[PDB]
């Protein structure tokens, strides 16, 4: 039951490069979800957490990434905005739970981290199941750009500053998301069921 192995990962990827660790063909004890005292948020959308153990899933998933602290409340169905469109779009029929916890004392640097980057602006919402690793140059105007800033040539790459003088909303946080799917296939993962 190697969920703690995912929990204690030393390094985390960028927000645009969220990694999916496939969970299948393993009996899920789900003991890690009990110790919620160390978890900042514990909520589920489209699924009843009480009936998680009593029902069996054909396949299950777990996704881990790092974002800022104040973005926890924006991870909800029916929400719009730049973060909800160009970073991660939640379908109205999403079935899963969103879990995050404090990591400022472990994932913050005095000089500021320069490892998590993404794309600030894009023309439209990301198509489903797309890995947004594109670094296209933003060009609002009709004047062509030669890769160097100038007349109507704005560099779309910006860096964040993690400093002690910053507020609470600049703190780094660990985020882990679990999604359970029930396709037109028989169940393969079952709880211990006492």
């Amino acid at each position, epitope marked *: 039951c190697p969920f703690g192995e995912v929990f204690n990962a030393t390094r985390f990827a960028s927000v645009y490069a969220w990694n999916r660790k496939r969970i299948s063909n393993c009996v899920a004890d789900y003991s890690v979800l009990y110790n919620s*005292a160390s978890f*900042s*948020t514990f*909520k589920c959308y489209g699924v009843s957490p*009480t009936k998680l153990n009593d029902l069996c899933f054909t396949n299950v998933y777990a996704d881990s990434f790092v974002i800022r602290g104040d973005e*926890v*409340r924006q991870i909800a169905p029916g929400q719009t905005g730049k973060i909800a469109d160009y970073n991660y779009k939640l379908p109205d029929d999403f079935t899963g739970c969103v879990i995050a916890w404090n990591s400022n004392n472990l994932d913050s640097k005095v000089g500021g981290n320069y490892n998590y980057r993404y794309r600030l602006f894009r023309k439209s919402n990301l198509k489903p199941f797309e890995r947004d690793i594109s670094t296209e140059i933003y060009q609002a105007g009709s004047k062509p750009c030669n890769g160097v800033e100038g007349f109507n040539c704005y560099f779309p790459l910006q860096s964040y500053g993690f400093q002690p003088t910053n507020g609470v909303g600049y703190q780094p946080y660990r985020v882990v998301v679990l999604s359970f799917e029930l396709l037109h296939a028989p169940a393969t993962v079952c709880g211990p069921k006492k």
Partner: antibody
């Protein structure tokens, strides 16, 4: 359906401790968690301590920790809440409550009749 | 530090809209669940609503609650007040490693 009986001492003079028990009867104690919470007169419910299913997680308030202890025993199918270093501000009514559902401790489900503990003269 | 401020009481004319609110600040209240409890005078507390969307067995169908995202607060409404429904209600929430119970808004049917 759910019936709880509590037995033990009541009024206690300062200088000695008190044996407090919330015996479990009519429900499978070893499958559900247990908690002890305080309800001071007039004021609302105030958290004092919480114990996990295995008891490895014991959390207490910062300003009162070190003296107040929480406990449980699955082997004996009974509940014990040992109170140490009782003061004049610790006089209130006590209750034993089990968590809502299995392995969930963010809510309270059933409250017994409770016991009265007083430290005064 | 997690103190709360609520109105002492609320009353409206019959036929109007009535709700019970426990509005928190210094942090989103919809981030975690809020539990509704009923405390009858001289009776042990009994859960009537849990997780803001489900009712235990035997709970009357007139009990309901939800979350209004416009103001980000928990509202509990009961339609058709009756004498048998008179009790004391409080909100519930847990913050990190401690549990905080709100003052609550009193609903009385006299």
């Amino acid at each position: 359906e759910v019936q709880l009986v509590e037995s033990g001492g009541g009024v206690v003079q300062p200088g000695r401790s008190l044996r407090l028990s919330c015996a479990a009867s009519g429900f499978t104690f070893s499958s559900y968690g247990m908690h002890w919470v305080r309800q001071a007169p007039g004021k609302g419910l105030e958290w004092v301590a919480v114990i996990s299913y295995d008891g490895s997680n014991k959390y207490y308030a910062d300003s009162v920790k070190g003296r107040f202890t929480i406990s449980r025993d699955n082997s004996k199918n009974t509940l014990y809440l040992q109170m140490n270093s009782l003061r004049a501000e610790d006089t209130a009514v006590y209750y034993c409550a089990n968590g809502f559902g299995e392995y969930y401790y963010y809510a309270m489900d059933v409250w017994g009749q409770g016991t009265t503990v007083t430290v005064s003269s | 530090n997690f103190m709360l401020t609520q109105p002492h009481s609320v009353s409206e004319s019959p036929g109007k809209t009535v709700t019970i609110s426990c509005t928190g600040s210094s942090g989103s209240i919809a981030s975690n669940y809020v539990q509704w409890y009923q405390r009858r005078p001289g009776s042990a507390p009994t859960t009537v609503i849990y997780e803001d969307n489900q009712r235990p067995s035997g709970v009357p169908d007139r009990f309901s609650a939800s979350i209004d995202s416009s103001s980000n607060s928990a509202s509990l409404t009961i339609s058709g007040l009756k004498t048998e429904d008179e009790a004391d209600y409080y909100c519930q929430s847990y913050d990190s490693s401690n549990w905080v119970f709100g003052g609550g808004t009193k609903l009385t049917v006299l």
